[PDB]
Amino acid sequence: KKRKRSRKESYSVYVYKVLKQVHPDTGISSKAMGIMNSFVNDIFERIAGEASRLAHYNKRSTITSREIQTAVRLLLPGELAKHAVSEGTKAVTKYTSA
């Protein structure tokens, strides 16, 4: 016994923080958290696969930002793509300035 289990990881600690900013008093369940984790992992793997395919098509060897932006514009539908691009550019600009 004595624990001896592969320590598993998830995004449960990060989802809870986001919920508190968007709605202050609500709460979430374990099944909903597991569904959100699967959704995040699926979006992550979709973005990664699209970026890798773009990099292999353009005969490049590094996945830089412009690649993720094109992957987002190709995957996300309408105004969600524009909003995600705007927020990503804001985050990249803040990270470059600081």
Partner 1 sequence: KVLRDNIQGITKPAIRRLARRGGVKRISGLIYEETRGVLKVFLENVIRDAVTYTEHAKRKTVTAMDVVYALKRQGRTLYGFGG
Partner 2 sequence: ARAKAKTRSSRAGLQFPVGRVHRLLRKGNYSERVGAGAPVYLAAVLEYLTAEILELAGNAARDNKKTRIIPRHLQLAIRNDEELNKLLGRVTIAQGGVLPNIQAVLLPK
Partner DNA sequence: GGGTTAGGGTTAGGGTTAGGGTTAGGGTTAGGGTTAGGGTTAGGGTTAGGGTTAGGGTTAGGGTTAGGGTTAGGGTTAGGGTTAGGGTTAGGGTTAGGGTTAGGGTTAGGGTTAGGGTTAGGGTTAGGGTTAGGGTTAGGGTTAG
Partner DNA sequence: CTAACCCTAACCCTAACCCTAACCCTAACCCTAACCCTAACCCTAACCCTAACCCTAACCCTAACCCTAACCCTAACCCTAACCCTAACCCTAACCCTAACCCTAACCCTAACCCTAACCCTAACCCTAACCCTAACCCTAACCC
Residue 73 interaction partner, one of partner 1, partner 2, DNA, none, beta carbon < 5-8 Å per kind:
partner 1
Nearest residue to 51 (alpha-carbon basis) of 73, 67, 32: 67
C-alpha separations of 47 from 17, 56, 88 in Å? 23, 14, 14
How many whole angstroms separate alpha carbon 49 and alpha carbon 43? 10
What does the binding site for partner 2 look like in residue numbers (CB under 8 A)?
Answer: 9, 11, 14-15, 17-19, 21-23, 25-29, 31-32, 35-36, 39-40, 42-44, 47-49, 51-52, 55-56, 60-65, 67-69, 72, 76-80, 83-84, 87-88, 90-92, 94-96, 98
Verify binding: residue 41, partner 1, rule CB under 8 A: yes
Q: Of DNA, partner 1, partner 2, none, which one does residue 82 interact with (CB within 5 to 8 Å by kind)?
A: none
